[PDB]
Design a binder for these strands. Structure first.
Length: 236
RNA sequence: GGAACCGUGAGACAGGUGCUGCAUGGCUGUCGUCAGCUCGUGUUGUGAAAUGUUGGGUUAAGUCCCGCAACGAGCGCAACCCU
């Protein structure tokens, strides 16, 4: 299970771009950063982790959102260790509301790939072929992780409430729990299960995203494994 | 006896570039070949509406690229015919 006393990674972040709604989580600004209370972060870890093991052992799906280039690679690897979905590139208009029509773009993607592998690849004009390549590119970029969705999630995990604020809104009107590791620059009231921690920093986001993923595989039907996201921490 | 056309007598009836196109169909002229004009759904607003068609680069052009709650689509453009 998780370990306490993480005063060598997370803690405070962001200079003076804070939101007054985050005072109950700030220790005390010193020369620059506001600094977060590691004493309050722990109790949050427990409450947030408790609700986690609930949906984990309940066979509930989670959607890890991460558009920020600070945890772009971490959000995927963490979502790979477990059988969960994720959004790494960019968050479309009516993916859940207008599911049917949106999937028609997925079917065309699979239909074009089957036509690009070898079957009738260079039969028609090249201009029309180059047209199928662009469509594939555009489709593969936006339909990268939503291609595995065949039915409408139980919860969403964000890395920053403000950056993925759009994901927070749609998750609120739908009545879906929201887990996320945000800091001073945000509104905690929007997160029913918030984790006061550094939003940025690769070594910061990987810790929890790796511990949370580890707590998911355990208490489900799998054994704990070493985090491969640590190799990406060498970005420093 | 009787089909046909035809002529006279008799009956029932036609016809009108006669008016109104501000009662109209159809067709045509014109601003225009001028270049853009809109829709479905989502989001924002009490609402009329807005967003998307704004912004940066670029082009003969919403031509294209980049960014962006927008995602797609239709008429137009382009392409498909002839000299």
């Amino acid at each position: 299970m998780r370990d306490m006393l993480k005063a060598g990674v997370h803690f405070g972040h962001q200079t003076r771009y804070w939101n007054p709604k985050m005072k109950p989580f700030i220790f005390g600004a010193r020369n620059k950063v506001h600094i977060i209370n590691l004493e309050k972060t722990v109790p949050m870890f427990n409450e947030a982790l408790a609700e986690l093991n609930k949906i984990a052992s309940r066979k509930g799906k989670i959607l890890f959102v991460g558009t920020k280039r600070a945890a772009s690679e971490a959000v995927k690897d963490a979502a790979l260790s477990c059988d969960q979905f994720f959004v790494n590139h960019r968050w479309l208009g009516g993916m859940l509301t207008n599911w049917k029509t949106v999937r028609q773009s997925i079917k065309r993607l699979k239909d074009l790939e089957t036509q690009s592998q070898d079957g009738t690849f260079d039969k028609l004009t090249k201009k029309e072929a180059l047209m199928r390549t662009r469509e594939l590119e555009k489709l593969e970029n936006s339909l990268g992780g939503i291609k595995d969705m065949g039915g409408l999630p139980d919860a969403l995990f964000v890395i920053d409430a403000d950056h993925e604020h759009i994901a927070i809104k749609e998750a609120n009107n739908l009545g879906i729990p929201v887990f996320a590791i945000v800091d001073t620059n945000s509104d905690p009231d929007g997160v029913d299960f918030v984790i006061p921690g550094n939003d940025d920093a690769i070594r910061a986001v990987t810790l929890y995203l790796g511990a949370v993923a580890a707590t998911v595989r355990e208490g489900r039907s799998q054994d704990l494994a070493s985090q491969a996201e640590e190799s990406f921490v060498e970005a420093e």
